[PDB]
Design a protein that fits this description.
part of a larger assembly, 7 chains, alpha/beta, Rossmann fold, 4-stranded parallel β-sheet, 5 helices, transferase (chains A, B, C, D, E, F, G), EC 2.5.1.78 (chains A, B, C, D, E, F, G)
Amino acid sequence: MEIYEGKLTAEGLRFGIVASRFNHALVDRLVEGAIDCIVRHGGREEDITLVRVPGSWEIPVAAGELARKEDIDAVIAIGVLIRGATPHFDYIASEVSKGLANLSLELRKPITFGVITADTLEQAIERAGTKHGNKGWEAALSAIEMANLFKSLR
Amino acid sequence: MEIYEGKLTAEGLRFGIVASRFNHALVDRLVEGAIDCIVRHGGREEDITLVRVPGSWEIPVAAGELARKEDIDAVIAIGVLIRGATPHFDYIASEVSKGLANLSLELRKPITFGVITADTLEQAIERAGTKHGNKGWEAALSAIEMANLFKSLR
Amino acid sequence: MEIYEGKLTAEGLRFGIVASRFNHALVDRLVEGAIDCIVRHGGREEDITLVRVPGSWEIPVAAGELARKEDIDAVIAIGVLIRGATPHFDYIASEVSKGLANLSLELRKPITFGVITADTLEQAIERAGTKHGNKGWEAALSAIEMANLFKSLR
Amino acid sequence: MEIYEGKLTAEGLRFGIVASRFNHALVDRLVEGAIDCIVRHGGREEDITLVRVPGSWEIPVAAGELARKEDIDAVIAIGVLIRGATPHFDYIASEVSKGLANLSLELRKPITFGVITADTLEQAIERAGTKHGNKGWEAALSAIEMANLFKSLR
Amino acid sequence: MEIYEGKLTAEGLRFGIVASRFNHALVDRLVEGAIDCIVRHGGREEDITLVRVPGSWEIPVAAGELARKEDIDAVIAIGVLIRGATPHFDYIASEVSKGLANLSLELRKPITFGVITADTLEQAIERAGTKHGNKGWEAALSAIEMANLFKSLR
Amino acid sequence: MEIYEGKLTAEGLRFGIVASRFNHALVDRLVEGAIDCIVRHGGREEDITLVRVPGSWEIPVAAGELARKEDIDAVIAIGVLIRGATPHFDYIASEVSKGLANLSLELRKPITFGVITADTLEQAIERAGTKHGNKGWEAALSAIEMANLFKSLR
Amino acid sequence: MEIYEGKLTAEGLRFGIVASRFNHALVDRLVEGAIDCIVRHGGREEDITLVRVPGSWEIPVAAGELARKEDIDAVIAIGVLIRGATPHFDYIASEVSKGLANLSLELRKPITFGVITADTLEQAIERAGTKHGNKGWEAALSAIEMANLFKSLR
C-alpha cells in the first residue's frame, strides 16, 4: 500500500495569514498562536506574509490574492464571528466558508479554516487561548502538514 | 532578557513510554498517538523504548527504571483511570501523581503526565481519540518540548 | 522498537505477603486467592513468606522489612478497609497508600496494592470472592508480571 | 510456608506513650486503657515511658525522640481530635497521620496510631470507654503484637 | 513510671515568631497575644526574634532559617487564611501545614502551628481576640511547654 | 526585640520566571504584570531569566533548574489552572503545589506561588488583570520582599 | 512615542495624610498601612505630616491646607464611611469626593482617595486589612507613583 502523509516540519515553507480586524481583542491572540506554531516547528518568521482585512466578510477575496502568488504554500484564514441579535451571523458565516472552500479547489492549494464561530462571548474566549487551546495554533498546524504533503502529491 | 523555550523538533531524542495494561481498549489508542507524535515530528521509532506494567499503580516504580538509564531524555506515563463504585479511584489516582512528580525532582528529568482521570466511561473515550484529541499525542508533545529545552538549561 | 513486558510464569520467584488481621473474615479469602494464583502459575508455596500485622495501618512498616531482604522479588499488601461512622477511614486509607508507594521508589522493587477500600460491607464481599473476583488473586497476578519484568529491566 | 506473627505476651518489652493534653477528659481514659493492656498482658509498668505534649499537632515531633532511644520497642500515639466549626480539623488530622507514618519507615520501628478522629462529641465518648471499647486498650494491643513480631523479622 | 511533661515557665528560652503580612488586621492581634504570653510567663522580650513574610505561603521557608539557628528553642508560625471564591484556599492551606510539620521532624525542634484557617471573615475575628481567645496566645503557650520539655528529652 | 522584614526595593536582585504555555491568553497578562513590577520597583529587565514550559505540570521540574543556579535570588511560578469536566484539575493542582513547596525547603530559596486556581473561566479573568489585580504583579512583589529579606537572614 | 510613568521609589518625597477620627477602629488600620507603604518603599517617616479631623466631612478643608504648603508632594485622604439608616451617607459621601477632586485641579497636585464607602460593617472590615487588602496601603501606593511622575510632567 502507498501511504501519504505530511510530516510536521515547517522548514522551507512560506505562509500567508489573512486576519480580520473586527473583534480586535480575540483575533490578536489567534494570530499570536499561528506565528508561534510556525516558528517553533522550524519555520522562519520572515517567510510569513500577514494580511489584514476590515471584517470577516472579506477574508475570501484577500486570501484569493495571497493564494495566487507563486511563493505561498498554504494560506491561513483567521477571524472571529460572534452571534448577536440578528441572523446577520448566519449569512456571513455561510459565505466566509464557501469562498474559502471554493477557492481551494480552484487554485489547488491548501486554505485552512481558522474561523471561530461562537454563540456566546464566553465560548469565543475559550477557543482563543484558554481551556480549548487557540484555533490559531491549530489551523496553522493543519497547514504545515498540508503544505508538506502537497510536495509529494503534486 | 533571556528567553528559554523548547522548539518542537524531535531529532536526536530518545524516549521512554510507560503504559499500563488495564483498560486495554483505551490505552492502546493513547500509545498510538504518542508514537505517532514522535515520528511525524522527526524522531525515529527505533529510539522509543516501550514498557508495559499491569495496572496504573505501578507506573511510578517502572518509570523510575527508565528515567535512570542515561540514554532516555524524557519519559511519558500513559494510563487510564475510570472512577467506579468505591474510593479505590482516589487513592490510586493520588499516588500515581505523587510518584511521577516526586520522581521528576529527584532525577531532574522530564516525566510528563499522560494519565486520563475520567469520571464516566464517556469522558474517557472523548479524551482518547475523539472530540478532545488524545492525551497521548499531547503528553508526547509536552515531552518533546521539555527534553529539547533541557539541552539549553543543563 | 524495544518492547518490554512481563510474562505470567511464576517459576523461580520468591514472594512476600503482608496481610492484616482486622476484618478477619474477608482478608482470609484474599490471602487464599493470592497463594492460589502463585501456585497454579507454577510457583512453589515454600517460597512464599506470609507476614501478619494487627491492622491495616502497619502494612507499610512490615512490608518494609520484607522488601529489604534480598530473596524477595515482589511484595503483596493485602488488607480490608471498610468505611464507618467517622473519618478514621480516610486518614488510614491515605497513609497505607503513601507508605506502599513511597517504599517502592525507595527500594526499587515492586509492591503491589491489594487493599480493598469499600464504602459498605456489601461492596467488600463482592471484591473478595464473588461477583468481581478477589483482589488477592489479582494483586498477586500483578506482582508475578512485575517481578518477571524486573529481571529484564535491571 | 513460613508464617510470621506476633504473640500477645508483653514480657520483656519497653513501651513509649505519647499523649496529648487537649481534650483532657477523653485522653485520660485512653491512657488508662493503654497502661491497663500492657500490665495485664504481663508487662511491668516501670518500663512504660509516658510523654505529654500540649496538642495533637506535636505528637509527631515528640514520638520522634522516643522512637530514637534504643530501649523503646514500640511507641503509642494517643490523642483526641473533634471536628469543630472550621477546617482546622482537617489540616491537623492530615499531619498527625503523615508524621507518624513517615516516622515508622524512617526509624523502622512500630508506631501504632491511637488517635480518635471523631465528628461529634458523641462518637468520641463511645470510642473512649463505652459502646466501642477504648482505642487506647486497642492501639496498645496492636503494638504489643508488633514489637513482639519485630524480634523475629529483624 | 517515668512521666515527662513541660512546665509553663518561660525563663531562659529564646523564641522565634514567623508572622505573615496578609490579613494585616487580624495577624497583628495574634502577634500581640504571642509576645504577651511569653513576657507574662517570665520571658524577656529581647530574646524574641520576629520575622515577617509577605504571605502565608512562605512561612515554611522562613521558619526554616529561624529553626536552624542554634539559639532558638521553639518557633511559632502565625498567619491568617480566609476562604474565598476559589480553591486557592486549599492548596495554600495544605502546603503551609506540610512544610511546618515536615520541618519539625527534620530539625528535631518544636514548631507550633498558630495558623487560623477560617471559612468566613466572622470566625477569623472570633479566634483572633474575642469569644474563643487568640491562637497567638495559645500557640505561644504550646511552644513554651514544648521547648521546656525538650531540655529533658534530648 | 529584633524585627526582620524585607524592603520593597528591587535593585541588585536577579529573578527567574517559570511560565506555562497552556492558557496562552491569561498567562501572558500575568508575565506582563510580573516584569512590570520588577522594573518599576527599580530592577533591570536584563537580570530577568524567563523560562517557558508546556503545561502547569512541569513548573516544578524547571523551577528546579532555575533555583539551583547561583545567580538567581528568587523564582516566580506563573501558570493558570481552570477546572473542567474531570478531576484532572485536582491531581495537577495538588502536585504543582507540593513540588514548589518541597523545592523551597530543599534549596532554601524563595519560590513564590503565582498560580491561579480558578473554578470558572470567569474568575480566572478577574484575577488576571481586572477587578482583583493580577497575581503576576503580586507574586512578583512577594519575591522582591523575600529575596531582599534573605540577605539579612542568611 | 513618549511614555511617561511613575516609578515606585519613595525617596526624597514628603507626604501628607489627612485621617478622620470617626470609625476610630477601622481608620487606624488604614493609617497603619499607609505609613507602612511609604517606609518600606524607601521613604523616611519624618517627612510624613499626619493631620486628624473629627469626621469625614472635613477632610476637604484640611487637605486644602496641606496641599498648599510647598513641601508636600502628594496628599492622602483616609476615612471610613458606613451606610446607616438615613441618606446622611449619600450627601456626605457625595461631598467628600467633590472637594477632593475639585482641590486637585485647583492646586495641580495629586490628592489620592483612600475613602472606604461600605454598605455593611462587614465589607468595611474586609477592605481594611483582611481579604481585600487595606486601601491605606493602596492609596499610599497610588500617591508615591503620582508624586514621582509629577517631577517629569511639570
